[PDB]
mmCIF file of C-alpha atoms in Angstrom:
data_model
loop_
_atom_site.group_PDB
_atom_site.id
_atom_site.type_symbol
_atom_site.label_atom_id
_atom_site.label_comp_id
_atom_site.label_asym_id
_atom_site.label_seq_id
_atom_site.Cartn_x
_atom_site.Cartn_y
_atom_site.Cartn_z
ATOM 1 C CA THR I 1 -6.203 16.571 -7.953
ATOM 2 C CA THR I 2 -7.050 16.143 -4.320
ATOM 3 C CA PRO I 3 -4.123 16.253 -1.750
ATOM 4 C CA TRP I 4 -3.455 13.386 0.558
ATOM 5 C CA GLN I 5 -4.503 15.466 3.627
ATOM 6 C CA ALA I 6 -7.124 18.082 4.358
ATOM 7 C CA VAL I 7 -5.529 20.194 7.068
ATOM 8 C CA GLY I 8 -4.717 23.175 4.981
ATOM 9 C CA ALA I 9 -8.099 24.089 3.758
ATOM 10 C CA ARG I 10 -9.509 24.358 7.372
ATOM 11 C CA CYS I 11 -6.947 26.636 8.490
ATOM 12 C CA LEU I 12 -6.879 28.870 5.350
ATOM 13 C CA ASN I 13 -10.527 29.323 5.450
ATOM 14 C CA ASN I 14 -10.667 30.000 9.369
ATOM 15 C CA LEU I 15 -7.945 32.566 9.272
ATOM 16 C CA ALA I 16 -9.613 34.327 6.094
ATOM 17 C CA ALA I 17 -12.969 34.522 8.115
ATOM 18 C CA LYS I 18 -11.572 35.810 11.503
ATOM 19 C CA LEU I 19 -9.419 38.438 9.892
ATOM 20 C CA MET I 20 -12.434 40.151 8.039
ATOM 21 C CA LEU I 21 -14.606 39.811 10.965
ATOM 22 C CA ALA I 22 -11.998 41.840 12.971
ATOM 23 C CA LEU I 23 -11.203 44.388 10.193
ATOM 24 C CA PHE I 24 -14.545 45.286 8.947
ATOM 25 C CA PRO I 25 -17.407 45.275 11.709
ATOM 26 C CA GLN I 26 -20.753 46.489 11.158
ATOM 27 C CA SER I 27 -20.411 49.691 13.085
ATOM 28 C CA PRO I 28 -18.230 52.492 11.464
ATOM 29 C CA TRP I 29 -14.509 52.207 11.493
ATOM 30 C CA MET I 30 -13.746 56.011 11.222
ATOM 31 C CA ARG I 31 -13.887 58.993 13.464
ATOM 32 C CA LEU I 32 -13.507 62.277 11.518
ATOM 33 C CA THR I 33 -12.324 64.270 14.489
ATOM 34 C CA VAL I 34 -11.688 67.950 14.907
ATOM 35 C CA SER I 35 -8.753 69.381 16.867
ATOM 36 C CA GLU I 36 -9.510 70.327 20.644
ATOM 37 C CA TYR I 37 -8.627 73.849 21.987
ATOM 38 C CA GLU I 38 -9.452 75.278 18.761
ATOM 39 C CA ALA I 39 -13.271 74.987 19.588
ATOM 40 C CA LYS I 40 -12.401 76.403 23.136
ATOM 41 C CA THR I 41 -10.462 79.563 21.613
ATOM 42 C CA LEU I 42 -13.366 80.150 19.225
ATOM 43 C CA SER I 43 -16.607 79.153 21.129
ATOM 44 C CA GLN I 44 -18.680 81.493 23.260
ATOM 45 C CA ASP I 45 -21.013 78.921 24.755
ATOM 46 C CA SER I 46 -20.945 75.396 26.570
ATOM 47 C CA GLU I 47 -22.883 73.859 23.841
ATOM 48 C CA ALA I 48 -20.645 74.045 20.734
ATOM 49 C CA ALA I 49 -18.479 70.992 20.685
ATOM 50 C CA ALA I 50 -21.484 68.788 21.050
ATOM 51 C CA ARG I 51 -23.149 70.356 18.049
ATOM 52 C CA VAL I 52 -19.934 70.099 15.949
ATOM 53 C CA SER M 1 -18.807 22.922 -8.551
ATOM 54 C CA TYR M 2 -17.974 22.494 -4.762
ATOM 55 C CA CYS M 3 -18.185 18.637 -4.650
ATOM 56 C CA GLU M 4 -15.208 18.373 -6.787
ATOM 57 C CA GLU M 5 -12.666 19.150 -4.257
ATOM 58 C CA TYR M 6 -13.339 15.845 -2.371
ATOM 59 C CA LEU M 7 -13.797 13.172 -4.967
ATOM 60 C CA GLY M 8 -10.584 11.380 -3.809
ATOM 61 C CA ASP M 9 -11.942 10.775 -0.231
ATOM 62 C CA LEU M 10 -15.044 9.165 -1.550
ATOM 63 C CA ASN M 11 -13.248 7.084 -4.154
ATOM 64 C CA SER M 12 -11.030 5.821 -1.421
ATOM 65 C CA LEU M 13 -13.799 5.195 1.208
ATOM 66 C CA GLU M 14 -15.881 3.192 -1.309
ATOM 67 C CA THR M 15 -13.136 0.851 -2.045
ATOM 68 C CA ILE M 16 -12.781 -0.203 1.579
ATOM 69 C CA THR M 17 -16.446 -0.694 2.506
ATOM 70 C CA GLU M 18 -16.980 -3.060 -0.256
ATOM 71 C CA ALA M 19 -14.154 -5.451 0.794
ATOM 72 C CA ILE M 20 -15.432 -5.147 4.395
ATOM 73 C CA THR M 21 -18.866 -6.204 3.376
ATOM 74 C CA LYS M 22 -17.699 -8.894 0.997
ATOM 75 C CA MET M 23 -15.659 -10.403 3.900
ATOM 76 C CA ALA M 24 -18.842 -10.689 6.114
ATOM 77 C CA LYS M 25 -20.834 -12.261 3.194
ATOM 78 C CA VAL M 26 -18.132 -15.012 2.767
ATOM 79 C CA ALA M 27 -17.644 -15.618 6.544
ATOM 80 C CA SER M 28 -21.266 -17.027 6.922
ATOM 81 C CA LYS M 29 -21.086 -20.302 5.123
ATOM 82 C CA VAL M 30 -21.108 -23.651 6.909
ATOM 83 C CA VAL M 31 -18.547 -26.408 5.840
ATOM 84 C CA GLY M 32 -17.677 -29.378 8.093
ATOM 85 C CA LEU M 33 -14.301 -31.324 7.728
ATOM 86 C CA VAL M 34 -13.960 -34.997 8.627
ATOM 87 C CA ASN M 35 -10.507 -36.294 8.961
ATOM 88 C CA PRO M 36 -10.051 -39.413 6.491
ATOM 89 C CA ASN M 37 -7.547 -41.495 8.801
ATOM 90 C CA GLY M 38 -10.137 -41.738 11.697
ATOM 91 C CA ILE M 39 -13.124 -44.076 12.714
ATOM 92 C CA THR M 40 -16.162 -41.687 12.712
ATOM 93 C CA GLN M 41 -18.711 -41.831 9.846
ATOM 94 C CA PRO M 42 -20.973 -39.027 8.572
ATOM 95 C CA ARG M 43 -23.733 -41.565 7.791
ATOM 96 C CA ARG M 44 -24.520 -42.233 11.530
ATOM 97 C CA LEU M 45 -24.478 -38.605 12.452
ATOM 98 C CA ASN M 46 -26.884 -37.531 9.622
ATOM 99 C CA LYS M 47 -29.496 -40.078 10.209
ATOM 100 C CA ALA M 48 -29.829 -39.767 14.027
ATOM 101 C CA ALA M 49 -32.719 -38.344 16.081
ATOM 102 C CA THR M 50 -32.762 -35.767 18.794
ATOM 103 C CA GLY M 51 -31.349 -37.335 21.943
ATOM 104 C CA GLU M 52 -29.725 -40.609 20.769
ATOM 105 C CA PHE M 53 -26.191 -42.405 21.419
ATOM 106 C CA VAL M 54 -24.023 -43.033 18.252
ATOM 107 C CA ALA M 55 -20.468 -44.211 17.903
ATOM 108 C CA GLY M 56 -17.642 -41.855 17.239
ATOM 109 C CA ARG M 57 -14.987 -39.666 18.695
ATOM 110 C CA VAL M 58 -15.222 -35.770 19.006
ATOM 111 C CA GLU M 59 -11.591 -35.369 17.926
ATOM 112 C CA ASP M 60 -12.171 -35.996 14.304
ATOM 113 C CA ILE M 61 -14.946 -33.280 13.351
ATOM 114 C CA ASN M 62 -13.919 -29.504 12.870
ATOM 115 C CA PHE M 63 -15.193 -26.494 10.946
ATOM 116 C CA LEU M 64 -13.709 -24.299 8.472
ATOM 117 C CA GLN M 65 -13.125 -20.547 9.513
ATOM 118 C CA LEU M 66 -11.630 -17.305 8.186
ATOM 119 C CA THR M 67 -8.493 -16.605 10.226
ATOM 120 C CA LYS M 68 -7.227 -13.098 9.135
ATOM 121 C CA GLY M 69 -5.807 -11.537 11.897
ATOM 122 C CA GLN M 70 -4.967 -7.732 12.501
ATOM 123 C CA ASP M 71 -6.257 -7.017 8.852
ATOM 124 C CA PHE M 72 -9.636 -5.857 9.873
ATOM 125 C CA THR M 73 -8.902 -3.218 12.678
ATOM 126 C CA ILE M 74 -6.612 -1.345 10.639
ATOM 127 C CA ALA M 75 -8.987 -0.940 7.724
ATOM 128 C CA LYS M 76 -11.920 -0.144 10.171
ATOM 129 C CA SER M 77 -9.617 2.650 12.003
ATOM 130 C CA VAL M 78 -8.658 4.266 8.575
ATOM 131 C CA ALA M 79 -12.182 4.242 7.277
ATOM 132 C CA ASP M 80 -13.387 5.907 10.646
ATOM 133 C CA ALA M 81 -10.966 8.762 10.046
ATOM 134 C CA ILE M 82 -11.985 9.489 6.538
ATOM 135 C CA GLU M 83 -15.502 9.661 7.603
ATOM 136 C CA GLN M 84 -14.867 12.449 10.172
ATOM 137 C CA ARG M 85 -12.491 14.183 7.847
ATOM 138 C CA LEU M 86 -15.434 14.338 5.202
ATOM 139 C CA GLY M 87 -18.035 15.332 7.864
ATOM 140 C CA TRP M 88 -16.077 18.410 9.085
ATOM 141 C CA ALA M 89 -16.668 20.018 5.821
ATOM 142 C CA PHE M 90 -20.416 19.774 5.269
ATOM 143 C CA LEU M 91 -21.410 21.013 8.505
ATOM 144 C CA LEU M 92 -22.588 17.747 10.277
ATOM 145 C CA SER F 1 3.092 35.643 2.118
ATOM 146 C CA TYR F 2 2.224 34.095 5.456
ATOM 147 C CA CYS F 3 2.115 30.492 4.433
ATOM 148 C CA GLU F 4 5.814 30.557 3.540
ATOM 149 C CA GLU F 5 6.955 29.818 7.012
ATOM 150 C CA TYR F 6 5.205 26.493 7.527
ATOM 151 C CA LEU F 7 5.910 24.556 4.112
ATOM 152 C CA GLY F 8 8.180 21.913 5.554
ATOM 153 C CA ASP F 9 5.682 20.734 8.267
ATOM 154 C CA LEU F 10 2.837 20.418 5.523
ATOM 155 C CA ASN F 11 5.251 18.561 3.171
ATOM 156 C CA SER F 12 6.220 16.068 6.038
ATOM 157 C CA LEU F 13 2.371 15.480 7.121
ATOM 158 C CA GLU F 14 1.560 14.803 3.374
ATOM 159 C CA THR F 15 4.450 12.253 2.931
ATOM 160 C CA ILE F 16 3.552 10.340 6.173
ATOM 161 C CA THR F 17 -0.258 10.363 5.486
ATOM 162 C CA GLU F 18 0.194 9.059 2.128
ATOM 163 C CA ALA F 19 2.073 5.913 3.363
ATOM 164 C CA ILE F 20 -0.409 5.489 6.252
ATOM 165 C CA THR F 21 -3.249 5.320 3.679
ATOM 166 C CA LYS F 22 -1.718 3.087 1.153
ATOM 167 C CA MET F 23 -0.904 0.324 3.788
ATOM 168 C CA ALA F 24 -4.520 -0.140 4.398
ATOM 169 C CA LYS F 25 -5.554 -0.778 0.691
ATOM 170 C CA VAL F 26 -3.055 -3.744 0.805
ATOM 171 C CA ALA F 27 -4.711 -5.387 3.965
ATOM 172 C CA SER F 28 -7.814 -5.746 2.012
ATOM 173 C CA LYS F 29 -6.978 -8.368 -0.394
ATOM 174 C CA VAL F 30 -7.749 -12.101 0.253
ATOM 175 C CA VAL F 31 -5.504 -14.844 -0.534
ATOM 176 C CA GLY F 32 -5.606 -18.401 0.834
ATOM 177 C CA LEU F 33 -2.553 -20.657 1.201
ATOM 178 C CA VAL F 34 -2.816 -24.476 0.879
ATOM 179 C CA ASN F 35 0.178 -26.800 2.241
ATOM 180 C CA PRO F 36 1.348 -28.871 -0.758
ATOM 181 C CA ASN F 37 2.742 -31.683 1.479
ATOM 182 C CA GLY F 38 -0.835 -32.593 3.053
ATOM 183 C CA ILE F 39 -3.988 -34.473 2.109
ATOM 184 C CA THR F 40 -6.693 -31.759 1.647
ATOM 185 C CA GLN F 41 -7.754 -30.765 -2.021
ATOM 186 C CA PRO F 42 -9.129 -27.209 -2.969
ATOM 187 C CA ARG F 43 -11.570 -28.862 -5.580
ATOM 188 C CA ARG F 44 -13.706 -30.149 -2.735
ATOM 189 C CA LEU F 45 -14.108 -26.776 -0.778
ATOM 190 C CA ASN F 46 -15.173 -24.968 -3.803
ATOM 191 C CA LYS F 47 -17.987 -27.287 -5.198
ATOM 192 C CA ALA F 48 -19.872 -27.754 -1.930
ATOM 193 C CA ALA F 49 -23.322 -26.278 -0.607
ATOM 194 C CA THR F 50 -24.193 -24.388 2.279
ATOM 195 C CA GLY F 51 -24.416 -27.192 4.709
ATOM 196 C CA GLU F 52 -22.278 -30.423 3.836
ATOM 197 C CA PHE F 53 -19.492 -32.863 5.196
ATOM 198 C CA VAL F 54 -16.352 -32.895 3.392
ATOM 199 C CA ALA F 55 -12.798 -34.637 3.734
ATOM 200 C CA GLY F 56 -9.880 -32.738 4.900
ATOM 201 C CA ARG F 57 -7.916 -31.147 7.905
ATOM 202 C CA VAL F 58 -8.062 -27.694 9.201
ATOM 203 C CA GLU F 59 -4.137 -27.597 9.711
ATOM 204 C CA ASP F 60 -3.516 -27.277 6.121
ATOM 205 C CA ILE F 61 -5.320 -23.928 5.509
ATOM 206 C CA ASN F 62 -4.170 -20.393 6.434
ATOM 207 C CA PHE F 63 -4.481 -16.917 5.180
ATOM 208 C CA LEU F 64 -1.743 -14.321 4.242
ATOM 209 C CA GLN F 65 -1.673 -11.189 6.437
ATOM 210 C CA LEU F 66 0.552 -8.086 7.213
ATOM 211 C CA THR F 67 2.645 -8.436 10.260
ATOM 212 C CA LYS F 68 4.053 -4.974 10.575
ATOM 213 C CA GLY F 69 4.847 -4.512 14.169
ATOM 214 C CA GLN F 70 5.469 -1.365 16.136
ATOM 215 C CA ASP F 71 5.716 0.734 12.911
ATOM 216 C CA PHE F 72 2.145 2.072 12.943
ATOM 217 C CA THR F 73 2.031 3.548 16.360
ATOM 218 C CA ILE F 74 5.203 5.598 15.901
ATOM 219 C CA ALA F 75 4.111 7.067 12.569
ATOM 220 C CA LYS F 76 0.520 7.827 13.822
ATOM 221 C CA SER F 77 1.723 9.621 17.065
ATOM 222 C CA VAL F 78 4.323 11.865 15.187
ATOM 223 C CA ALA F 79 1.452 12.757 12.600
ATOM 224 C CA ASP F 80 -0.838 13.786 15.350
ATOM 225 C CA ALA F 81 1.948 15.923 17.178
ATOM 226 C CA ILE F 82 2.612 17.583 13.719
ATOM 227 C CA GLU F 83 -0.996 18.296 13.286
ATOM 228 C CA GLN F 84 -1.475 19.849 16.777
ATOM 229 C CA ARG F 85 1.445 22.009 16.210
ATOM 230 C CA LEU F 86 -0.175 23.402 12.904
ATOM 231 C CA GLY F 87 -3.642 23.961 14.946
ATOM 232 C CA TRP F 88 -2.163 26.505 17.230
ATOM 233 C CA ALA F 89 -0.845 28.968 14.344
ATOM 234 C CA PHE F 90 -4.123 29.388 12.541
ATOM 235 C CA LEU F 91 -6.455 29.894 15.466
ATOM 236 C CA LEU F 92 -8.215 26.660 15.219
#
């Protein structure tokens, strides 16, 4: 049965849409980084961090 | 289906538009009332021509009218709100 | 859950809206009222035609109507305040 008011549905749908728009974008949401100063103590050239 | 969530609103609106229309169809009928303790006679008004002097008084003739007061604006205002509430959900 | 914190407001809004709606289906019923200590008879107003002259007075007919005073604006304004309060928490 239909409730006497129609204010809850709008709010719930709006929040559900916005939360997913913020949480899961099209561009990647990860980084997979490597520690610094460990390339520095091991590299021998100025083009190692870029390649990694 | 998706239309089953809003059946109550449509059933509510269709019960007020009908009454509003019926009132307008009833308030367009002409009935004239002649007071029976007076001196004017409908037989002289009915058989006269355009631009003619007859005998009578203008205090004995009156018409019937619907005199419901603030029972029209309330229904109009509620039906107006339901329409916008139903239009916010179908992307109009 | 997140909707736990806002249940009383929704309950109050529903309670007020039900009465506001149901007071509009009572003001859509037509009932005439004829004064028994007068001279007009309801049998003549019912068998007439679209334009005719009948016998009676206009002081003996009047219609029933709902005369609730300043008990509509108060409830309406409180309902709007509650709705506006709820709108700020769900990013509408």
